[PDB]
Enzyme design. Structure first.
Site, short mmCIF file in Angstrom:
data_model
loop_
_atom_site.label_atom_id
_atom_site.label_comp_id
_atom_site.label_asym_id
_atom_site.label_seq_id
_atom_site.Cartn_x
_atom_site.Cartn_y
_atom_site.Cartn_z
N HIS A 44 1.91 5.19 -2.35
CA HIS A 44 2.03 6.61 -2.52
C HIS A 44 3.26 7.18 -2.54
O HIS A 44 3.21 8.45 -3.94
CB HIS A 44 2.02 7.04 -0.80
CG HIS A 44 1.03 6.95 -0.09
ND1 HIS A 44 -0.22 6.75 -1.02
CD2 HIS A 44 -0.03 6.22 1.25
CE1 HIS A 44 -1.42 6.92 0.28
NE2 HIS A 44 -1.08 6.42 1.76
N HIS A 103 0.94 -1.02 -0.21
CA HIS A 103 -0.22 -0.31 0.14
C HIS A 103 0.78 1.17 -0.21
O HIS A 103 0.92 2.30 -1.09
CB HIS A 103 -1.01 0.06 0.84
CG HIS A 103 -1.31 1.32 1.24
ND1 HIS A 103 -2.85 1.29 1.35
CD2 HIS A 103 -1.32 2.28 2.31
CE1 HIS A 103 -3.66 2.80 1.63
NE2 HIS A 103 -2.36 3.32 2.01
N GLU A 104 2.34 1.20 1.00
CA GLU A 104 2.67 2.49 1.22
C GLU A 104 3.55 3.48 -0.08
O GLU A 104 3.60 4.07 -0.30
CB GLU A 104 3.58 2.02 2.66
CG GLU A 104 2.61 2.82 3.44
CD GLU A 104 2.71 4.36 3.82
OE1 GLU A 104 2.63 5.18 3.27
OE2 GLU A 104 3.41 4.39 4.75
#
Ligand SMILES: [Ca+2]
Ligand SMILES: [Ca+2]
Ligand SMILES: [Ca+2]
Ligand SMILES: [Ca+2]
Ligand SMILES: [Zn+2]
Lengths: 532, 12, 14
Positions: A404, A400-401
């Site tokens: 970003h 997920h990160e």
């Protein structure tokens, strides 16, 4: 448990509920709805309950007390509610009654008993010293607990809880004027606190976390002045010589170095710029995936490096294809290679990542985009391994990160704070959508559980209150819906976000929320019917 | 920033 | 900033 029993106007009723229901039921009052807290924590109840607690504490004969545990828990629960609930306020005659009750327990001959049952009630008394604003009143007792502590006390979980509470007292004392004016004169406290931190038998033992807290609070004492100053300095110097920044006792060394660096002159202790040296020592492995991803890690296997690089590489391709980037970054962005910094565990992250990256560590990792336009800016994702993280890399929050980083470099102009319109739904929704694709049972489940959000509501999402359901699951649902049903719209939006036209971005998605709500609901229906 | 203590951890 | 006896490993990112 029956939380409504604590709402009676009669103090005797509330006292009887505390006694009969016990501490595990009193726990509910910390989180109860305001109506319950307002009734339970009336000034009159706090006073009457404290007066009862005083008599009972005087009579205490050791060996624990279920009732006293519950009573002191209730009293400090009242101060918790008073702090956070604008409709709970105490008249001035409350705290003296509470101080009388704490005194009665402190002055009891059984106060320093070593046992888990005593630790359960003692713990709540020690925390009440902080919650009730009495940090100035029990410094001789703080000193005694620090010097009396030994391996026999350390065998008992609840004695560890209880004496660890004295570090809460020292921390909370910063806001107590009487504490601030007297703590710097407490030479015996400073000696005992330093010698607690220097206790070699704490290293690797059940109470190491207490020794580290002692080192941190000792370093915090450099913010005060008075007759104890030379003792504080001498004990800190001994900590920095006895232990080291990476190795034996480094939790204590780094704890003290944190507060010394913030409140004192690092040059007085020879620890200026330890953070740069620490990074090379802890993050000793380097594995370059590609020109766009490099891993620094503390202790990963070759197989983990290979798996992390290929998983990120797959997400990277899926991102660039899905977002139609042409691999062209936004303007004023030179974050050419993400640095992925992976500590060996959550505990290591909490110890080392703070000083290395100048971050808070009460979290599951963080991505620092920095200032992408500034020469020498380094994009850093900071993370740790965990046994329940995803195979085969076992890096917590990695997939997920990582998105970003991509979203920040290829979709969103500027640093993290550049947007002048709300963009949480997009940032978190695209990180979920790229990393999970169409495998998201939690997002299906939140459609069919009786609570849904409209597109309008989703676009207004913020981090305030941290509604994970709204941020992560409904951000994912809105993003996935737009990609599947309105991709040309998404490309239109990206023209604006990629150059920082945030007002244009808002006007664009405002149209989506007016037009597409019923179709969004039909699309949710199809998702639910597919599940069945 | 100051925050009063909530619950202490029980032994597993 | 004193640590409690138990800290959580599986936290959301900051
Ligand atoms: Ca490892
Ligand atoms: Ca950016
Ligand atoms: Ca729901
Ligand atoms: Ca609703
Ligand atoms: Zn995120």
């Amino acid at each position: 448990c029956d939380v409504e029993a604590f709402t009676s106007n009669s103090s005797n009723d509330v006292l009887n509920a505390i006694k009969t229901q016990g501490a595990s039921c009193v726990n509910a009052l910390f989180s109860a709805e305001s109506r319950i807290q307002e009734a339970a924590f009336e000034s009159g109840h706090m006073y009457n309950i404290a007066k009862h607690t005083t008599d009972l504490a005087k009579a205490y004969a050791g060996g624990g007390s279920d009732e006293l545990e519950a009573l002191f828990l209730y009293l400090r629960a009242g101060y918790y509610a008073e702090f956070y609930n604008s409709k709970v306020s105490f008249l001035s005659w409350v705290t003296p009654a509470v101080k009388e009750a704490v005194d009665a327990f402190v002055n009891n001959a059984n106060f320093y008993e070593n046992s888990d049952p005593h630790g359960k009630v003692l713990s709540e008394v020690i925390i009440t010293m902080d919650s009730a604003g009495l940090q100035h009143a029990y410094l001789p007792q703080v000193t005694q607990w620090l010097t009396r502590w030994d391996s026999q006390y350390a065998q008992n979980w609840y004695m560890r809880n209880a004496v660890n509470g004295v570090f809460t007292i020292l921390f909370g004392g910063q806001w107590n004027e009487q504490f601030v004016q007297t703590i710097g004169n407490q030479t015996e406290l400073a000696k005992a606190l330093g010698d607690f931190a220097l206790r070699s038998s704490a290293i690797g033992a059940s109470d190491e976390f207490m020794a580290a807290n002692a080192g941190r609070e000792l370093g915090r004492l450099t913010k005060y002045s008075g007759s104890a100053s030379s003792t504080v300095k001498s004990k800190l110097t001994e900590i920095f010589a006895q232990y080291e920044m990476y190795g034996r006792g480094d939790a204590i060394w780094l704890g003290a170095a944190d507060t010394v660096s913030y409140y004192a002159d690092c040059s007085d202790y020879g620890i200026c710029n330890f953070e740069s040296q620490l990074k090379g020592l802890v993050l000793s492995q380097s594995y370059t995936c590609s020109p766009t991803i490099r891993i620094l890690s503390q202790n990963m296997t070759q197989d983990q490096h290979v798996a992390a690089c290929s998983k990120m590489g797959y997400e990277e391709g899926y991102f660039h294809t899905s977002l139609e980037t042409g691999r062209q970054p936004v303007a004023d962005d030179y974050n050419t290679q993400l640095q992925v910094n992976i500590f060996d565990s959550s505990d290591d992250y909490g110890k080392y990542a703070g000083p290395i990256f100048n971050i808070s560590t009460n979290n599951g990792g963080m991505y620092l985009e920095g200032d992408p336009a500034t020469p020498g800016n380094i994009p850093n994702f900071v993370a740790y391994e965990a046994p329940y993280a995803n195979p085969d890399h076992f890096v917590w929050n990695l997939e997920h990160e990582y998105v970003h980083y991509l979203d920040g470099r290829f979709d969103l102009y500027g640093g993290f704070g550049h947007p002048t319109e709300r963009i949480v739904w997009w940032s978190e929704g695209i990180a979920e959508y790229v990393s999970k694709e169409n495998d998201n049972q939690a997002a299906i489940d939140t459609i069919k559980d009786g609570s849904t959000f409209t597109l309008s509501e989703i676009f207004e999402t913020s981090y305030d209150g941290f509604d994970v359901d709204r941020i992560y699951r409904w951000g994912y649902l809105a993003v996935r819906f737009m990609f599947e049903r309105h991709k040309d719209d998404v490309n239109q939006m990206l023209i604006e976000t990629r150059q920082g036209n945030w007002a244009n971005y808002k006007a664009t998605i405002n149209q989506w929320a007016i037009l597409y709500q019923s179709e969004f609901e039909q699309w949710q229906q199809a998702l639910v019917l597919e599940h069945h | 920033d100051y925050a009063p203590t909530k619950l202490l951890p029980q032994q597993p | 900033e004193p640590s409690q006896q138990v800290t959580e490993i599986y936290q959301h990112h900051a």
